[PDB]
Every structure is written in C-alpha cells, then in structure tokens.
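Predict the holo structure. Ligand: 7Q5.
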Amino acid sequence: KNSLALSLTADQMVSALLDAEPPILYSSMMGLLTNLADRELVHMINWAKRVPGFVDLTSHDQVHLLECAWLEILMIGLVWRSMEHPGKLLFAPNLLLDRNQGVEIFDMLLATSSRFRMMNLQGEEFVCLKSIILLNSGVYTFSLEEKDHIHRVLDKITDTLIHLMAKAGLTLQQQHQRLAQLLLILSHIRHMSNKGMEHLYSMKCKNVVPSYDLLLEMLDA
Amino acid sequence: SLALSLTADQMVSALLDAEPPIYSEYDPTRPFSEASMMGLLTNLADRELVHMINWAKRVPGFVDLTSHDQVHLLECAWLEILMIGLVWRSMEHPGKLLFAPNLLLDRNQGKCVEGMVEIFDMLLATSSRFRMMNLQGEEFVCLKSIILLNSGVYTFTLKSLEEKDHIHRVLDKITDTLIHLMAKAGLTLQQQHQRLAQLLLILSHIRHMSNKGMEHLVVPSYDLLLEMLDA
Ligand SMILES: COC(=O)/C=C/c1ccc(N(CC(F)(F)F)S(=O)(=O)[C@@H]2C[C@@H]3O[C@H]2C(c2ccc(O)cc2)=C3c2ccc(O)cc2)cc1
C-alpha cells in the first residue's frame, strides 16, 4: 500500500497519537463502572479511527481488532491514570478506589501501575503501547494484505518507540532493554483482560461486552 | 549468583543444552472420542511437566529464586510453555499440530473435543507466524525462557523487591542475547529492534491461547510442582 501511515516520521506518529488521546471522563460499583466504560467506548471508536493505518483496513478487520482489544485498552488507560496514585485505581477523578473497596484483578492492575511507575513510563510511550494493543491483539486470529499492512504499521510504532528513547538519551542497549520491558507488560495486560472477561461472565455480565455488530455500527456512525 | 555474569553466547549455550526431550501412547484406538483424546493429551502433558521442571532449573537465574517463587512462575507459565513447544514442533507441518511424533493432528480432529477447535486454530496461526518469521531455534529457547520468567512476575517486602529485580535483570540479559543473535546473523539495527518487538508481541498471543485453554477446561497443583522442584 501507498499508505500515509507508512510515511510518518516518529515525531508525526507521536503527534498523531497524542492528538487522538481521549479525555479523562468522570463517573452500585458495577453500575458506575459499566456506565463509565460505555462512555469510554464511544471515545475509543473515534480514537481508533485516528490511529495511523487503522482506517486503511476493511471495516470487518477494524471491528475484529476492536473486539479483541477493547478491555485491554480500557485497562491500560486505567493503569496510566492510576500511575501517580500508589495503591489506588483512578477509574475516574471522582471514582478513586483502594484494595479494600475491591480483588484479584484489582491487585493485578495495581501491580501494573507499580511497574509503569518503576519504569518511569512517559506519556509518549503510553500512547504507542495503546496503539500496539489495538493493532496486535487481534492480528493472529483473522486478508494477507491486511495482516502485512498491520505488521508494517506495528514496525513503525516500534521505530517510534526506539526514536523516543534515543532522543531521551538512552544508549542502544538501554533502548532495546526498555523496548522489551514495555512489550512484555503487554502480555500481563492481555492476561488481566482475559481474567476480566472471565469475571464479567462469572458475574452474569455477558451482555455488557460489545458485540461484532455493535462495534461495526459504531464504526460506521 | 553468576547467572547475570553470563555472556550472550553462554546464555544461548546454556539454554540449548537445557532443552527437554520430545511420544504419545502407541496405537491408541482411532477414531478418538472426546474422553480418549483428552486422556491422551493429559497423559502427554503430565509426562512433559516433569521434564519442564528439569529444564526450568537450568534456565540461568531460576534457581536463585525462593522455592515458592519458582513454583509461582511455573504455575503461571506451564501451559504457555507447553504451547510454545507445540507451536515450534509444528512449524514444518502447515495445517497440523505435532503434539508428539506419533500424534500429528489436523484442525478437524480438534473438533473431537468441545471447544478445542478454536484453540487449535489459534495454535496453527501461531505456527504459521513463526514460519513466516523464520523463527530460529536459538530465538525459540530465549522466548521460552522469557515466558517462564515473565508470566508470573507481575503477580508476586525487601526480599520480594529483590526477587522481582533479579527476574527483570535476567529478562534484560535474555533481551541482550536475542539482540546479539540478530546482530550476529547480520540484521541491521532497525531490523533487530523490529524483529525483537515482533517476537515479543507473539508472546501476548501465546498468553491469550493459554488463558482460553485454561478456561474451556488436570492442572498441576502448587504441591505437585513444589515436590517436582525439590526432587
Ligand atoms: C455491584 O458492584 C459489585 O459488587 C462489583 C464490583 C466489581 C467492579 C470491577 C471488577 N473488575 C476488577 C477490578 F477492576 F475491580 F479490579 S473487572 O470485572 O475485571 C472489569 C474490568 C475492569 O474492572 C471492571 C470494569 C468494567 C468494564 C466494562 C463494563 O461494562 C463494566 C465494568 C473494567 C474497567 C477498566 C477501565 C475502565 O476505564 C472502565 C472499566 C470486579 C467487581
């Protein structure tokens, strides 16, 4: 493809993703969280359309990626928002919870926030990671041209991460180490998403996960 | 500990040397029932686990951890480790899963067990991805060791902070090792960072498959893992 996305510099990629960032939204615990997530989803769709390369995909492939990524995306945002509140999860500025208000999944989310803190994760890195989640989470479960495009965009995001690190003065060795540390946390975000989904099902909340058709209609709108 | 003093070459040699052996029951009644196929796979996994513990003990850094932390890591990783091994064995058999030399199954056979075809299809896609990437054996063994160290590190006092820090340093050494292998192969710096990312991103898919596998469902107990570690 002669795609605009593939011509982007590291700086343009960061700029696009920072510009696409949704606002931090305000708020029965499950009731509150469901209402918040539902409002977040609307923003997520519109954000996804702004991730470079995402709209080059067929509508079907866009929906597939969103279906596979949505809860991981919510989670990573939660973790980012909570990074400067040790021991707490900032679901919203008016819904900031500690463990006691929880717990298995709460504890996993808190450990991720601690990891982000210990690594001094930067906003520019965060937005790259969130975009990787969107592009990567569904890419192994899809056509050939689409997968190739996704992987080329993913490679651009890698290049962008490395450029950011090099600009901040990290040595080559530090760059590769940090890249790996950031990407390895994604496996834990996937794990938490799967546990979350298993828990949404266990609480009889199958209804609240967005369907293929819901996402499709939301993308078209 | 000297694990963190290893060179990239020594890390690769240690991991290659540590590799566990590769059979299923001879002449099982075929076709399989749901019960009989699950019986075969359970028997195979159970025997593989014993060799997995022996392998884990030889992953540089692993035995520096407390016994409790060793078991925690194995509890979190065991299914992913079995699955990556399966995917690796299956690379040169497009459309098939080489559970054992004598148990080579296609996706239609996954249908014999309720819920299993979906996991089979994900495993097959991973094998195709490894093939498309020309995954090398030296890379494979690094990735498998990453899984062991990474999967449970986020779900663990001064001691605990030192345990986590040690794990992360060993993970850093394996990263360095992967990069060295790539640089030695002649990849450009850009190509190196790209391939590293591509490989680590597949690990999130392996996680996913393990989680789904665990669900749809014979899981090894804390006590069994601990006994095997001590023996
Ligand atoms: C009646 O109220 C109750 O008793 C039940 C209370 C309760 C409350 C949360 C629980 N989880 C574990 C966590 F986050 F708490 F640690 S979670 O299921 O994995 C699930 C995941 C994550 O936390 C839940 C919630 C969610 C998502 C979609 C919905 O439609 C409704 C809720 C998430 C979320 C993350 C980021 C964000 O920006 C917005 C939402 C578990 C029991």
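The two ends of chain B are 21 Å apart (CA to CA). Residues 16 and 137 of chain B are 8 Å apart (CA to CA).
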